[PDB]
Every structure is written in C-alpha cells, then in structure tokens.
Amino acid sequence: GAMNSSNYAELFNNDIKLFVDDTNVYRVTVHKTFEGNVATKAINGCIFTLNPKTGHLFLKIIHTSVWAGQKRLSQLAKWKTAEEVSALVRSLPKEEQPKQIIVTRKAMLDPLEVHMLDFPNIAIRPTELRLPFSAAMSIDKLSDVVMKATEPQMVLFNIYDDWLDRISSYTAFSRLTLLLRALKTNEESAKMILLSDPTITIKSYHLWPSFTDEQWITIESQMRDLILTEYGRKYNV
C-alpha cells in the first residue's frame, strides 16, 4: 500500500521500483492581458521518474505543443504523465520493468492504474513521505535540457553521478533528498553553498560537484543548517 518512514529500507532492496513525480509536467507563468484579464503561458515541463536504488532518472520532457488546443490542462497533465510512464515501462525489457511504481502525489493513482491495466503485477503505490522532487528544475543541467527542448524528448541521467562507487543507495538517496529539500527551501542559498569554492567543479558527465568524502560532510552540514534557518523564519521558532 502506502510507502512511509516504517518501510523506508524497501526503496533500496533488489525489487526494481520507480518514483514518479508529476509536479513539473504542467508549468505556467500567470500574466495580465491588454484588457486587464489574467492569462497563462505554458513552458516546457518534465516527468521525473527515478530508480532510487540505481539513480537512473528517466526525464521525459513535456513540450508546450502537447497542451495546444486542450482543455482542463491540470487534469490532462496527470493522464499524459500516466500515458508516458506506461509507454516507458512497455519500452523496457521485461527484466528491467519495475515491480512497483510509487507516485509522489495521490492524484496520480487512478490515472496511472488505468494506463497500467495491461500490467496487473505492477503495484501502483502512494507515499506518505513529503519528497522534494519538485526541486529537480533547480538542477541547472536538468532545467537547461527542459527549456531548450523544441519537441518531446526523453533524456537519461544518473542523479547520483558516481556516488554509488563510494556510498550505499540509502546514503545516496538521503544526500539527494537533503540537496533537493535545501534547493526547494532556499534555492539561492543552496546553490551558493554548492559553488562557494570555485576549485570544486561539475564534471561534463555529472549534475553535482566532485566533492571528496570530507567536503560532502561539510556540504551536507551547510544544507541542514540552511533548512533549520529557513524553518526558524517561516514559523518564527
């Protein structure tokens, strides 16, 4: 059923699973029209489909053309997300197909379940975890490929760079969620922390800087402190 704190270790076992986050599929800027009414302009979006064990990210770019002449776009966005996830599973070899798909928002359950009728043995699960995957568009290289897309496109990343050479997927996932939580709370501060020392670079084939084990401990501490600071502001505590 629902994924939470109690069954956390299950994310890192050997059963293939994917997280799906639909929060950046339908993206708009709200603006004033010449007559002083309000209008939206859509921008390129993305489905964020992540294997939490391996770091493999299936970033399906949603081009603005998919909304052209459609009504009830916030509803369509859930169905288009389910259609694309379904097409991705069918495109994978059998032994690569997930046994579970966890949706980060409960509104995805019915759309994904109706699109995956052909896969009755794939479990569609919600989560009680508050995951920060909305902040994926705060990762410069992911944001760049989405905004430059001129057509629908699938781009394959490893969101953990080479971390699994040195740490477990449990620790890699904890690092990723803390980075994304920081980027989501204070994007400017988070990004300042990640580039503060210009000697540490992002390899062409990576998303994050090349921190040594010791520099990661420092960065992780700075991210935690950023999250408490911001918290003792929202709430004044």
Binding site: P111, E113, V114, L117
Partner: protein, 300 residues
C-alpha cells in the same frame, strides 16, 4: 388472483410478501396468502423470531406453476415447493380459503408501488442471476455473495449479477484511458447495453432486482450492484433521453419505499452525492433529487 398456501407455521416468524409483512406466532393456524396480483414477480420472505440472522426468501411468478410453503424441521427453514397435481393444489387452497386461514395480499387499488419497483423484473432473468434450474422459483438470503465479491466461495450459491468494474480492460479501451474513465458512455452504451444486456429493459430489470434483494434481505453484494449500475449511468455523458427519464422514476420509487431507519447502511453517500450533484446527469434526476433531499438530507 393466485395463492401460495402454507402446510403450517410451526415456528414464530415474520412473513413478508413483496412490501407487506405479518407476524405469525409458533403453531398459529396460518395456511397462507391469497389474492396475489397476477402479472408481476413476487417475493415471499422470512425472518425467524428466535434468530433474526438470515433473512431469506423466494422469488416466484404464479403464472409459472402452483407454489406452496412447508417448514422443514431438518434444515430449519420455510421452503418453497411446486405442486405438479393441479387438482390436489386447487382442493388444498379451496379448503383453507373456506376456513379463512389465509391473509389477503393487502393491495390498495390506487397503489402502483409494487409495479413501479418491479416494472422491468422478469422471472427468466432472475433465474440466470440465481442458478437452481430444477426450481421455477429462486431462493435468496442475507449472506449470499455475488460472483464479483467471490473474485476478490461456493459458486452454486452465488448471485451472478453482471460484473461492473470501472478500472478493468472491459471498461477502458486502449488509447482512450482518460476519455473512458471520466466519461463511461462507451462502457454503458456499447459494452453493457448493446453488448451484454441487449437493451435498457434488461439493464433496469437487474438494477431493480439488486435493489429489492438489498432492501428485503439486507444483502450487501446486491446493494453494491444497485449502486454500481446507478453510477455507470450517472457517470456517462451520453445516455438516451428515455433511459434517464425512466431511471428518475425507478430510483424515485426505490427511495420512497426504503425504510427510513435503513438509509444509514443501504445508501452509499459517495455514489448519491456524486450522482445528484457532480455527475453528467446531476440535472436529469429531478424526482429522485427532490425525494432524496426531503427524506435523507443528512446523507447529502
């Protein structure tokens, strides 16, 4: 007018005939029910005074044979049985009638309630939902499960209602996932009406039969079927005008007849709120909405 004679009444029981009921005391000289209107299915039903558990009963049509009730002290229930000897039967009934040991189906002349609740219900269709081919009458009770309930345990004692499942390959055409899920018109009109029921009459017949089994026996699976068949129509954007007009009349009489004290367990809040207020047909059930609002405004 036709008669269901009783051999005897050895155990204290509440006897139902359609929407009417009488208390019979242990060994009371009760020998049955006369003046039963020809032209409708009927249900004769039972709730033992000493164990209110298992309401049970028989669906029958007097045009299809001569039927009587006899208590079986082994299986501990009132059983329906067919008398094949026409002359023996007429002679039993005549004796009991002359001795006035029979209650009169208490039909008020202006009252169309039973016709309105059974307008599309046919014995032949009942006998396909309740399979026991050696009898012309059909046993139902409180605890019998539906084919669909068993899928999710004795197959011969099942209610074989048409399976409706909004998240099934049957309900959802490949490449029309969102369309078919949010607008069930193809599932209602092509799969169910044209495909399985053949016409709206058979569809309404099953819907009405499901309601009556829910109401008379507290059969939980029948209640689920009645709601599903309502929701499939209300969730369809395209429904023939005559079907919507008929549905309003059918539900009106069902809601009117429901015991007031049973609306808590028999009516599904989600389905009704959705059907009356949110669905495509939210504006097509005037009669049903007016009675629901005036009789069960807590539910909404």
């Amino acid at each position: 007018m036709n008669t269901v004679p009783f051999t005897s009444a050895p155990i204290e029981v509440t006897i139902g005939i359609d929407q009417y009921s009488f208390n019979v005391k242990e060994n009371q000289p009760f020998h049955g029910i006369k003046d039963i209107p020809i032209g409708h299915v009927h249900v004769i039903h039972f709730q033992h005074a000493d164990n209110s558990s298992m309401r049970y009963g028989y669906w029958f049509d007097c045009r299809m044979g001569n039927f009587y009730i006899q208590y079986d002290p082994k299986d501990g229930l009132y059983k329906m049985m067919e008398e094949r000897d026409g002359a023996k039967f007429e002679n039993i009934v005549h004796n009991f009638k002359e001795r006035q040991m029979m209650v009169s189906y208490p039909k008020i002349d202006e009252d169309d309630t039973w016709y309105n609740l059974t307008e599309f219900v046919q014995m032949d269709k009942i006998r396909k939902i309740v399979r026991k081919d050696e009898n012309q009458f059909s046993y139902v009770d409180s605890s019998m499960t539906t084919v669909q309930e068993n899928e999710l345990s004795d197959p011969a004692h099942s209610l074989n209602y048409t399976v409706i499942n909004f998240k099934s390959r049957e309900a959802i055409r490949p490449g029309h996932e969102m369309e078919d899920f949010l607008d069930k018109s193809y599932y209602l009109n092509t799969v169910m009406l044209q495909g399985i029921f053949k016409n709206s009459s058979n569809y309404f017949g099953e819907l009405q039969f499901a309601f009556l089994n829910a109401m008379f026996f507290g059969n939980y699976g029948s209640s689920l079927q009645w709601h599903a068949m309502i929701e499939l129509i209300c969730s369809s954007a395209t429904v023939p005008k005559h079907m919507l007009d008929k549905l309003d009349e059918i539900l009106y009489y069902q809601i009117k007849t429901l015991p007031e004290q049973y609306s808590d367990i028999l009516l599904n809040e989600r389905v009704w709120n959705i059907c009356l207020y949110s669905s495509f047909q939210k504006n097509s059930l005037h009669n049903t909405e007016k009675i629901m609002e005036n009789k069960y405004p807590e539910l909404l």
